[model samples]
Every structure is written in C-alpha cells, then in structure tokens.
Target: MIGEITTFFGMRVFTDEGRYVGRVEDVILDQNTKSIRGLAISDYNKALIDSHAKGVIIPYRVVKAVGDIIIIKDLFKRKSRVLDYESRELIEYVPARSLARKSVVLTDGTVVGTLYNITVDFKTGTIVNLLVKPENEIPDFKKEEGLYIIPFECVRSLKDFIVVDRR
Candidate 1:
C-alpha cells in the first residue's frame, strides 16, 4: 500500500510486541536525501514518556507495518533529548514541514529545484521515489507544473541543502 506522509498523522502506533508506542504526530525527512527517516510520536503512553522524551521519534528502519495503525519493532534506544535534534551528531530529527520547499542540489553544486513529494510503500514503510519541482524546463512540460521523479538511492545526505547524484 502506498501512503502519503500527511496521512500518517493521528494514526495509532504499536510495537511488534503489541506494546503501545504512541500516535503519529509528524514525519521527519532527510533534508538532502528527501527520504523519510523517522516518525515523531505524540500523545504517547505516560510510562513511555517518562522513559523517553516528550516527543519520541521512531526510526523508519524499525517500522514493520503501516495501515490503520503502525507497528514498529519494539526497539527503543535512549539517545538524547529531542531538544538536541539539530545537533548533527544524531539522526531522525524534527519533522521538517518545510522540506517540500527546500531546494535540491547536485554534489558538484548544480541546482535541482525544491522537493515536491516523497512517495513511499506503506507496506514496507520505506521511501521509493522523490518528486522534485523543476525551476528549469523539463521535456514536454511548462514552468508552473511538472515533477521529476528521483530514485531514492540517488540521494546522498541531509544538510542545509539537499544533495543528490543525478548521474
């Protein structure tokens, strides 16, 4: 099943062991890669909150299933407080809502325009393709609309700008 990142909000999240994790509050996308790496859980269990931080992030790698409810691997590692999300040492930071408006550039510094959407396979909960809005012209297209699909593997990393290897 394919799903939109926005549709995940408010969905119940559970562990493989059936332990209650939390509710899907938002999604974290790698700024450069345009890949979703984690889910920010809110309205979580009180006990889990005491163990984790106020806003808990569940990595996409731990996600086992997604549907009416999301099921994870039941693996919780105490890394650091969510306040340090932008420190660069750790991954799975805040759900950057403005990612769609961020521009993507090549490693050599060629512009690729802002990211449009990240298509995912809900069954695996992994990113499959990244849609980018073109600043320049695309074949058989106009300026106002038209999206270019970038394979997920083409992404490099997340920084102030999106970096990709179009080659």
Candidate 2:
C-alpha cells in the first residue's frame, strides 16, 4: 500500500462508519513537530468539528490510505476535519489584510493548489489572486504551454471532492 501513495490530497475519505468525509483540501504539516497535525478537510459543512466541545480530533496516526479513498480507522475519531491555518484569514472584516488563502479542490477531487496573496479590487469588489503550488512546477497540464485556471463554477463548494487521476 505504501507504493500507491501519490498526491494524498484530493482523494475521497471515509470514516470507519462509512460517512463520506469530504475530499482533503490540504494537509497540515508541522515540520517542527515532524507530524501532520490535521487535515484541512472540506467536509465541514456536512460534518462539523468544533473546539470547546467533546470530540476527538482526527488523530493523524489513524489514517489508513491516501489515494482514491482516504480510509480512517474509526468514527469516534470524529471532530470536524478542521482548518489547520490562521482562521482570521477568511474574514473580510479583518482589516489591513487583502490576501487570503483558499482551499482549491478540483471537481475531480484533486487539490490543484492553495490560492494565495490575493489582491482585492474594492471598486469592482472582485478578487484576483495567484494559485500557488511549487509542486505546480509541472508545465501546462495537458501537454501544452499555458496558464492553469479552474473555472469558478467547476468548484462544488467550500465542501466537495478534488478527485485526481493518479489512480
């Protein structure tokens, strides 16, 4: 099973209870701790995990697989698959901040990258930003030289899958 590992992100994950935990948006790595602290899981709208509540964190040790399907060892491991970054980054009211990071999950359940360093045009109330992925060093996705952009509509929600074909 170790050989099957690829872009562990963007795969469909499930609880031992068979609940469909949304595809992973990104992984939270704690380089200092040498551990994966959490999954930036996209299934929150469906399965909410909260702090100050009685619940278990998605213990990093319990993960069984990462491709095609993310298999968890149990459901009591249930806490909303939580955000692993700065929470204030999402609030528009947070002043002096124009850039925000969004979890990008391709409809096919593949994590393309994290959209960051966004500059918002107030006059137009539109956001124009860059999708950053060093792993994105690979050239034009389909054997061509071009920019890669996923249409907004192709996204299912803050929740859904980013299915990948590295199957």
Candidate 3:
C-alpha cells in the first residue's frame, strides 16, 4: 500500500547531526504483519563507527525523518558497540588556554580587536561574553573605559582568528 520498497534500497542514511551513516543495502520485512523490520546499511562512515563486518542492521524504530537522506536517532551506545569490536576511538578536543590573545575579526574580514579576556559563568563553567580590546573607537558597545563586550553567541568561528557577527 505504501511506496515501492525497491526505492529505499539505494537511499543514503545520515544522523540527525548530518553525519553520513550509509546507504540502504536491504530492507527487512515482517511477512505476517507486512511491516518493515529494519534496514541493512552498507558502506557506512568508518570514522564514525568502525566495523570488521560488511554492514550493520539499524532498527526501523530508531529512524527519525526520511527524504533525500534518512535521519536516525543519535544513539551513543550503537556507536560504542562498533568501537568496542573494532577498537577505534575518535575525539575532538580544543584547549581553552589556547583561545587567549587571538585576534578578533568580523564576518567581513575586518580586524576589530584582540581577545582580552573571557567572562565565564562559574556555576555552569561556560563562556558568558568575550572582553575585546578594540583597536579603534567602535560604536554601540558599552565601553568599560576601553574594552568592548561581545556576547558569546556572536562568535562565528574559533579558527586562526576569532570571527564574530558584526550585527
């Protein structure tokens, strides 16, 4: 009664975060109830989940939305299972100490100031605002003598320069 089952075979699958999972190799079915059991995924993201096996079966219940790509639930345990068997680990770590003294630039590539200090919420241990020492007189900032306060949300990137949204 639904759309052709063959159409789902080659469809790409991704996580809600947009991380590629794999392509649908086969669709499992429950013959009696005429219901989809799960999906057999192949050629998946090796970096995300390493496996010695050819593929993995993803439960149909975990699938979120489907269109050009299938979005699945963000399950850490599923990823850990693959890691445990394959003996691979992935980590993205950025040291907070290195953020200091970096040049602050706008989205338009204008160097506005240098990062002077960061105000942190001690309770949550999260960044509140960035204290920037302006290179020149800037408007709209409630200048504390010389420092300009930029909200943490205004930050665009933390690359070679600290990029911020001008508005």
Candidate 4:
C-alpha cells in the first residue's frame, strides 16, 4: 500500500519543473477489473479555474509522488507518460456549460474509464482542481464510497463518447 500522502486525493501535485497543472477530482474504477485506474484531474490553467472550469483526466502513470506534493516528474521532458502537444488540435477546450453538452477527454490521448466530476485535492495542489465528467456528471453513489480508484495506467487508449447517465 502507498503511504497516507500518496492516497491523499486532494494533494496539490505539480511538476518539479514548476508548471502548475491541476487537482484530483474523483477516482475511477472498472466494474469488471476492480482496481485503481485513472485520476480525474482538474486542469488548472489559471484561465480555466477563473471561468469555473471543469478538470481533465490524468493517467496514474504520469503521477510521480504522493507526499507533501504530487510531482509530475516528466513535465519538462514530456516523457512517455506526459501528454503530447500534437493532441492540442483535437482538444475542444470548453467550459462546464458547453462541456456538459459534449464528451470531453484529457487532451487527446487514451485513458480507460470515462472522466467525471473534479475534486479539489485536500492535501496539495489545492488551487488546481482535478478531473471532470464526460457530461459533467459524476458516477452514481454506491452507499458512501461510490467512486473507487483502480489501476488505470494500463488503459493506453482514449475515445470520445456521449454520456446520458442511465443510472
């Protein structure tokens, strides 16, 4: 098991390079697999937060640390885990209102479970909220701990799909 710091969802994690990213929104889990997947990260681009923005998705693999601050070890180098700029062309960059009207993904890469409701990392990276919903709708509550985090780094693909929220 990771330390308390690592699991502290709302920790404000950033790149040692000093690029402010976002916070941890919600945790996703696959019904079939049942393991920690991707982190719903709110993209903190100053501009986004100012407009009451929704967050984006961050692959668990890109996550470096979980102590005082979660570090994006590859921000400067743009290594394997970091999102490529090429996807910028594909990004829609819409707010929650407009965002709710469409299916949004983190940039244009690939993650397993769908993205949803952003949560402020209570620990660090508080300013940058994390994660956002596809339709800006979080998953249904199952008792109290409805949202569970599973290993989503294995998800090496991301596709866009409209969500209506059946449940």
* Strongest candidate by lDDT: 1
Model 4: per-residue Cα lDDT over 1-167, one tens digit each: 23222354675757767676677665553323323345567656563234464766565556666666667654433224434666433322222222222333333432223444433333232312223322222333122233323223322222344222222
**Residue-level lDDT tens digits of model 1 in 4-27:** 566787899988888898898788
Residue pairs whose backbone atoms clash in candidate 2: 49-80, 108-162, 108-163, 109-161, 109-162, 109-163, 110-162, 110-163
What is each predicted model's overall lDDT from 0 to 1?
0.71, 0.41, 0.67, 0.41
What are the models' TM-scores?
0.64, 0.36, 0.44, 0.37
Our tally of clashes for model 2 stands at 8
Write out the backbone clash pairs for model 3. none
The per-residue C-alpha lDDT of model 1 at residue 70 equals 90
Worst 10 residues of 3 by lDDT: 119-128
Going through the candidates in the order shown, the clash numbers are 1, 8, 0, 30
CA shift of 95, model 4, Å: 20
lDDT per residue (tens digit) for residues 1-167 in model 3: 12334446688998888788999887654323324557788998788776878988887777876666778886634432235555776443233335657898877777778988665432223355678889866564556757888876677677678888855
Residue 88 lDDT in candidate 1: 48
